Amino acid sequence: SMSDVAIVKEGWLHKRGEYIKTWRPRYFLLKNDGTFIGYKERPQDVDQREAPLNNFSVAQCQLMKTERPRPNTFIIRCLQWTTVIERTFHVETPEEREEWTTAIQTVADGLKKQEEE
Ligand SMILES: O=P(O)(O)O[C@H]1[C@H](O)[C@@H](OP(=O)(O)O)[C@H](OP(=O)(O)O)[C@@H](OP(=O)(O)O)[C@H]1O
């Protein structure tokens, strides 16, 4: 129960709009249960933590590193209920991008092992 809701990684990033393709600052949190949740403002209490702006599930996701429109961009391709979606993120260094993509992959891998077991 409690290990599943551990926060694996959290931090600020920029998230690109889907239609108005600007880079928007968002605070994201990844948990062991595959939830990847974003906030406009970094939450400062539990009520704020419980009301994210963005909410994705990283189970079986694909993780793509790209250099356009900016270096150090990454794309997650994931399933949102029954629709495949892509979301685009940016951080300031390739090392930080690797930290995020590896963290997400590690969580996805743990979920697949749970399924197998
Ligand atoms: O603002 P524009 O460019 O019009 O497009 C919006 C933003 O990309 C939203 O992200 P953000 O909330 O981070 O601004 C996104 O929410 P999610 O990424 O949470 O899905 C919306 O998807 P919808 O969820 O389909 O509304 C999408 O339609």
- What's 86's domain CATH number? 2.30.29.30
User: What tokens appear for 75 in the block?
Assistant: 């794309």
3-state secondary structure string, 54-74? Answer: EEEECCCCEEEEECCCCCCEE
Give the number of domains in the chain: 1
Residue whose CA is at the smallest distance from ligand 1 atom 17: 54
Residue in this structure with the two tokens 């809701």, named with its chain if needed: 5
User: Domain range for residue 81?
Assistant: 1-117
Residue 114 CA, ligand 1 centroid: distance in Å: 31
Resolution in A: 1.0
Prior bond to 69 cis, omega within 30? yes
Question: Quick one: which of 42, 51, 35, 45 has its CA closest to 11?
Answer: 42
Reported as type and span, the H/E element at residue 35 is strand 35-39
Pocket lined around ligand 1, Cβ cut-off 6 Å: 15, 17-20, 24, 26, 53-54, 87
Question: Quick one: which of 15, 32, 35 has its CA closest to 24?
Answer: 15
